Amino acid sequence: GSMGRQCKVLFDYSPQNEDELELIVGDVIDVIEEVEEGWWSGTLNNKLGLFPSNFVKELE
């Protein structure tokens, strides 16, 4: 319930696990809610995953 806004991918993230969402630079990820500070939960097109809020900013 943070009224979270979509975060655009600014930096490259090569995931350590496939549970980690592949951050493609330039695209935007629709986040549901953040679960553990760094690790947010959202889906990029058809893959749902966890992504670190370091490489993505809620600037939109």
Curated annotation (Swiss-Prot):
Phosphorylated on tyrosine residues; probably by c-Abl, Fyn and c-Src. Residues 5-60 form the SH3 domain. Disruption phenotype: Death at 6 to 7 weeks of age from renal failure. Mice show defects in epithelial foot processes, accompanied by mesangial cell hyperplasia and extracellular matrix deposition. Expressed in podocytes (at protein level). It is found in: Cytoplasm, Cytoskeleton; Cell projection, Ruffle; Cell junction. Homodimer. Interacts with F-actin, PKD2, NPHS1 and NPHS2. Interacts with WTIP. Interacts with DDN; interaction is direct. Interacts (via SH3 2 domain) with CBL (via phosphorylated C-terminus). Interacts with BCAR1/p130Cas (via SH3 domain). Interacts with MVB12A and ARHGAP17. Interacts with ANLN, CD2 and CBLB. Interacts with PDCD6IP and TSG101. Interacts with RIN3. Interacts directly with RET (inactive) and CBLC; upon RET activation by GDNF suggested to dissociate from RET as CBLC:CD2AP complex. Interacts with CGNL1 and SH3BP1; probably part of a complex at cell junctions. Potential homodimerization is mediated by the coiled coil domain. Seems to act as an adapter protein between membrane proteins and the actin cytoskeleton. In collaboration with CBLC, modulates the rate of RET turnover and may act as regulatory checkpoint that limits the potency of GDNF on neuronal survival. Controls CBLC function, converting it from an inhibitor to a promoter of RET degradation. May play a role in receptor clustering and cytoskeletal polarity in the junction between T-cell and antigen-presenting cell. May anchor the podocyte slit diaphragm to the actin cytoskeleton in renal glomerolus. Also required for cytokinesis. This is CD2-associated protein. It comes from Mus musculus. The gene is Cd2ap.
